[PDB]
């Protein structure tokens, strides 16, 4: 099981590719779509590349020997109207030659290659090299130096629609330069978003009939007096069960080791600057999963309360976002009886730059200023918006109750 082109191992699918075995084809995609010849004769419906032409183009390169190796089977030809200098792909990644991700898809020799004029990578946390060929520039703000490999898997993890400079969010110049310098913007959706659990979290809704005396939970009717009405007031709380007319109500109560790197140092980073006076810590000796307390913010009905959150971060933090939930019940709108939180920045607006003090801020800020016009709970959004003293009256007398 070799690719047909450069005769390797499918090896990490990051560096050569998603190694593809169909129509009894065996290949790496950045191999088929780096080959210099192959001129997507197919609809998109091997990505655009009929195994005829991939036949020719294996043909074509057992013609042609690899600069590295000695060895045949190379297809890869530095685009260079003189040079002649062709190689195999991963040859060409090891030795240091540059292969681009648009237009042509054109690659280039060490000899020829674009460069750049040209501390820490930020997003790694660690010292960067003094090979300037793994060492990547903004043109953008920070101009920062990343390594190449960083800035490969937050092109891999966040998709295009979410490459975007980590500071000034460039989308424009950014990524043209990135995609001029060799870096793969691979057209999809962001990783978080493509794993299977996705986020169903924000999805669910309360399906619970909590009366004593049921007419019957599990199932409840689309309509009738068997269907479902939820409490006006929290939303967290069948409708002939009710025992009101459908003709409102309200319930009772309302009557992978650069990942554990990065996280020691944003775990120190918090306890040198705690954002809203929050403890945060490990649980037991998971540093994948937090536990923190915040204390709530002045000027909000929920000033005085404690609120406890759980944080599970991923194995490719900080590529993709951490999971937070809170453990205290909250009376808000973008957060739910399970303690989900609605918040951009957990799924969208992602920047592998942003910390978890910056997570833990911008949830101080969304209990200050929350969103009503995208609510994870409608029947609170609407009160919100319409009568804000209830509103807050019921925050606060929640704040009492629970919380604090
Ligand atoms: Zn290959
Ligand atoms: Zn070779
Ligand atoms: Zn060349
Ligand atoms: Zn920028
Ligand atoms: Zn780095
Ligand atoms: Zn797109
Ligand atoms: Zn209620
Ligand atoms: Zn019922």
Same mark, same amino acid.
């Given at each position: 099981?070799?690719?047909?082109?450069?005769?390797?191992?499918?090896?990490?699918?990051?560096?050569?590719?998603?190694?593809?075995?169909?129509?009894?084809?065996?290949?790496?995609?950045?191999?088929?779509?780096?080959?210099?010849?192959?001129?997507?004769?197919?609809?998109?419906?091997?990505?655009?590349?009929?195994?005829?032409?991939?036949?020719?183009?294996?043909?074509?390169?057992?013609?042609?020997?690899?600069?590295?190796?000695?060895?045949?089977?190379?297809?890869?030809?530095?685009?260079?109207?003189?040079?002649?200098?062709?190689?195999?792909?991963?040859?060409?990644?090891?030795?240091?030659?540059?292969?681009?991700?648009?237009?042509?898809?054109?690659?280039?020799?060490?000899?020829?290659?674009?460069?750049?004029?040209?501390?820490?990578?930020?997003?790694?946390?660690?010292?960067?090299?003094?090979?300037?060929?793994?060492?990547?520039?903004?043109?953008?703000?920070?101009?920062?130096?990343?390594?190449?490999?960083?800035?490969?898997?937050?092109?891999?993890?966040?998709?295009?629609?979410?490459?975007?400079?980590?500071?000034?969010?460039?989308?424009?110049?950014?990524?043209?330069?990135?995609?001029?310098?060799?870096?793969?913007?691979?057209?999809?959706?962001?990783?978080?978003?493509?794993?299977?659990?996705?986020?169903?979290?924000?999805?669910?809704?309360?399906? &619970?009939?909590? /009366?004593? =005396?049921?007419?019957?939970? @599990? *199932?409840?009717?689309?309509? $009738?007096?068997?269907? %479902?009405?939820?409490?006006?007031?929290?939303?967290?709380?069948?409708?002939?069960?009710?025992?009101?007319?459908?003709?409102?109500?309200?319930?009772?109560?309302?009557?992978?080791?650069?990942?554990?790197?990065?996280?020691?140092?944003?775990?120190?980073?918090?306890?040198?600057?705690?954002?809203?006076?929050?403890?945060?810590?490990?649980?037991?000796?998971?540093?994948? &999963?937090?536990? /923190?307390? =915040?204390?709530?913010?002045? @000027? *909000?009905?929920?000033?005085? $309360?404690?609120?406890? %959150?759980?944080?599970?971060?991923?194995?490719?933090?900080?590529?993709?976002?951490?999971?937070?939930?809170?453990?205290?019940?909250?009376?808000?709108?973008?957060?739910?009886?399970?303690?989900?939180?609605?918040?951009?920045?957990?799924?969208?607006?992602?920047?592998?730059?942003?910390?978890?003090?910056?997570?833990?801020?911008?949830?101080?800020?969304?209990?200050?200023?929350?969103?009503?016009?995208?609510?994870?709970?409608?029947?609170?959004?609407?009160?919100?918006?319409?009568?804000?003293?209830?509103?807050?009256?019921?925050?606060?007398?929640?704040?009492?109750?629970?919380?604090?």
């Amino acid at each position: 099981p070799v690719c047909l082109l450069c005769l390797q191992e499918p090896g990490d699918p990051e560096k050569l590719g998603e190694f593809l075995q169909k129509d009894n084809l065996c290949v790496h995609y950045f191999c088929l779509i780096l080959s210099s010849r192959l001129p997507q004769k197919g609809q998109p419906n091997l990505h655009g590349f009929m195994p005829e032409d991939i036949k020719r183009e294996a043909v074509r390169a057992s013609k042609k020997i690899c600069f590295v190796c000695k060895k045949k089977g190379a297809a890869i030809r530095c685009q260079n109207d003189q040079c002649v200098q062709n190689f195999h792909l991963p040859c060409g990644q090891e030795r240091g030659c540059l292969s681009q991700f648009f237009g042509e898809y054109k690659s280039y020799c060490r000899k020829h290659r674009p460069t750049q004029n040209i501390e820490s990578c930020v997003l790694c946390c660690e010292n960067l090299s003094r090979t300037s060929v793994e060492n990547i520039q903004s043109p953008c703000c920070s101009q920062a130096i990343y390594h190449r490999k960083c800035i490969q898997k937050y092109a891999h993890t966040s998709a295009k629609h979410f490459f975007k400079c980590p500071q000034c969010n460039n989308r424009e110049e950014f990524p043209q330069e990135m995609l001029r310098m060799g870096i793969h913007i691979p057209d999809r959706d962001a990783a978080w978003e493509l794993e299977p659990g996705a986020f169903s979290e924000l999805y669910q809704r309360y399906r &619970h009939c909590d /009366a004593p =005396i049921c007419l019957y939970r @599990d *199932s409840f009717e689309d309509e $009738g007096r068997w269907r %479902l009405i939820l409490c006006a007031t929290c939303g967290s709380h069948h409708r002939d069960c009710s025992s009101l007319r459908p003709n409102k109500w309200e319930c009772n109560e309302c009557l992978a080791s650069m990942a554990l790197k990065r996280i020691h140092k944003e775990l120190n980073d918090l306890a040198r600057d705690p954002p809203a006076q929050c403890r945060a810590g490990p649980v037991g000796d998971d540093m994948f &999963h937090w536990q /923190a307390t =915040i204390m709530g913010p002045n @000027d *909000s009905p929920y000033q005085g $309360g404690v609120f406890f %959150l759980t944080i599970h971060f991923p194995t490719d933090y900080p590529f993709k976002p951490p999971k937070v939930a809170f453990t205290t019940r909250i009376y808000h709108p973008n957060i739910n009886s399970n303690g989900s939180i609605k918040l951009d920045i957990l799924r969208s607006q992602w920047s592998p730059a942003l910390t978890i003090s910056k997570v833990l801020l911008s949830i101080c800020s969304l209990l200050c200023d929350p969103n009503p016009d995208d609510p994870l709970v409608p029947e609170i959004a609407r009160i919100y918006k319409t009568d804000r003293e209830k509103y807050n009256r019921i925050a606060r007398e929640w704040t009492q109750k629970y919380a604090m």
